[PDB]
Design a protein around this ligand. Structure first.
Ligand code: HEM
Ligand SMILES: Oc1ccc(Cl)cc1Cl
Length: 137
């Protein structure tokens, strides 16, 4: 289920973080303009960039903590507030996060592993709602 999925993902953290982020960037190539020097590079070129692995892991580490602190796939409002106020997230909108969770859910459904994809979809929708309530446009 959702709780065990967190453990599954944390158990192969680097690989899942990179695969899911790349799935997002490839499903929605427009989203690359939020990042520096990701344009014009294949997945393997991105994975070999300095910062890329470090960044993707730090994002994914926090996403798993937010999922782990949720009850019934409802994230804590305080976690949403932290995500809204981060300087690195200024100018983002909830649409950026909705697209990330669309890509994550699609990746889980296409995977050979048995993820609770509908719970991740609900979690993403509840996170989007919490981000709005916390002030994200
Ligand atoms: C629940 C989802 C997310 C979480 C937990 C999260 C968390 C984080 C964290 C922890 C960092 C700091 C990384 C570091 O300094 O090494 C970061 C940076 C950043 N995030 Fe988010 N993030 C999320 C979603 C997104 C989305 C959807 C976007 C845009 C589509 C985004 C864009 C950025 C950018 C542009 C930065 C700074 C650029 C950089 O890391 O060099 N994030 N995020
Ligand atoms: O910037 C990111 C890094 C890793 C993941 Cl999974 C998502 C995002 Cl937006």
């Amino acid at each position: 289920g959702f709780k065990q999925d967190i453990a599954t993902l944390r158990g192969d953290l680097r690989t899942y973080a990179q695969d899911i982020f790349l799935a997002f960037l490839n499903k929605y190539p427009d989203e690359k303009r939020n990042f520096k020097n990701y344009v014009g590079k294949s997945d393997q070129e991105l994975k070999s960039m300095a910062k890329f692995g470090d960044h993707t892991e730090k994002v994914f580490n926090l996403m798993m903590e937010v999922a782990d602190r949720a009850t019934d796939c409802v994230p804590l409002a305080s976690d949403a507030s932290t995500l809204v106020q981060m300087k690195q997230h200024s100018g983002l909108t909830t649409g950026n996060f909705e697209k990330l969770f669309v890509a994550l859910v699609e990746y889980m459904r296409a995977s050979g592993q048995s993820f609770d994809s509908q719970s991740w979809d609900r979690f993403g929708k509840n996170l989007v709602s919490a981000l709005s309530s916390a002030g994200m446009k």
